């Protein structure tokens, strides 16, 4: 029984709710494709668009074995303008502790209450961010840890869904404004979520 995979599974489920919500509150897509729902006992917005939904799953399906190996240091939802320049980064900094501790108190009730706080902060972040320009799009950047091997082999999990190395323009953001959202430390997961925004 591999608890590093349990942790990968909680993170991928949560990262899916979180991408969907980010796309909502940053209005990356039209509002009508979203349905209000509850996850982590808290309101969220999930897209009902089939291929957007398939694209987010394929992305996260590819990330998940790196998560199970603790080989991922950040997962970044980056939002691009009509000119392919980053306007916002949503940085999920993730580290499993050196040894996972698994309580029988209620391991998953608790991590879910801690994840719920990340969702709530995402909801109210449009109260402090500048409205995005029209025609913005998104992508997902994965930063791996230094002792990680042939990531571009381990990460290509899905048949016709290649991964590449990003360019400097994909990620360039000279002197951004930093917006912390939430931080958690659990026996299984240390996670930071903050937003970098273009000056």
């Amino acid at each position: 029984l591999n608890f590093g995979q349990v942790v990968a599974d909680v993170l991928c489920e949560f990262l899916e709710v979180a991408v969907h919500l980010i796309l909502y509150v940053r209005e990356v897509y039209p509002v009508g494709i979203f349905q209000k729902r509850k996850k982590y006992n808290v309101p969220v917005q999930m897209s009902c668009h089939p291929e957007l939904n398939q694209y987010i799953q394929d992305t996260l399906h590819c990330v998940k074995p790196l998560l199970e190996k603790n080989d991922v240091e950040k997962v970044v939802v980056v939002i691009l303008d009509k000119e392919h320049r980053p306007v916002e980064k949503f940085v999920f900094e993730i580290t499993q502790p050196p040894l996972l501790s698994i309580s029988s108190d209620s391991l998953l009730s608790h991590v879910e209450q801690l994840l719920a706080a990340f969702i709530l902060k995402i909801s109210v972040c449009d109260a402090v961010l500048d409205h995005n320009p029209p025609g913005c799009t998104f992508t997902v950047l994965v930063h791996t840890r230094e002792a990680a091997t042939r990531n571009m082999e381990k990460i290509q999990v899905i048949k016709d869904f290649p991964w590449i190395l990003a360019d400097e323009q994909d990620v360039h953001m000279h002197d951004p404004r930093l917006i912390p959202l939430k931080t958690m430390t659990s026996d299984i997961l240390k996670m930071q979520l903050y937003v970098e925004e273009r000056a």
Binding site: Y29, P30, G32, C48, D58, L141, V142, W163, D170
Partner: peptide
């Protein structure tokens, strides 16, 4: 320098969004 998907996320026309709103709740 990080990795990203080579495939871009879909473009969604507002008619397609009206269809989603209308038929897939």
């Amino acid at each position: 320098l990080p990795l990203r998907p080579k495939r871009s996320p879909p473009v969604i026309s507002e008619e397609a969004a009206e269809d989603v709103k209308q038929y897939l709740t």
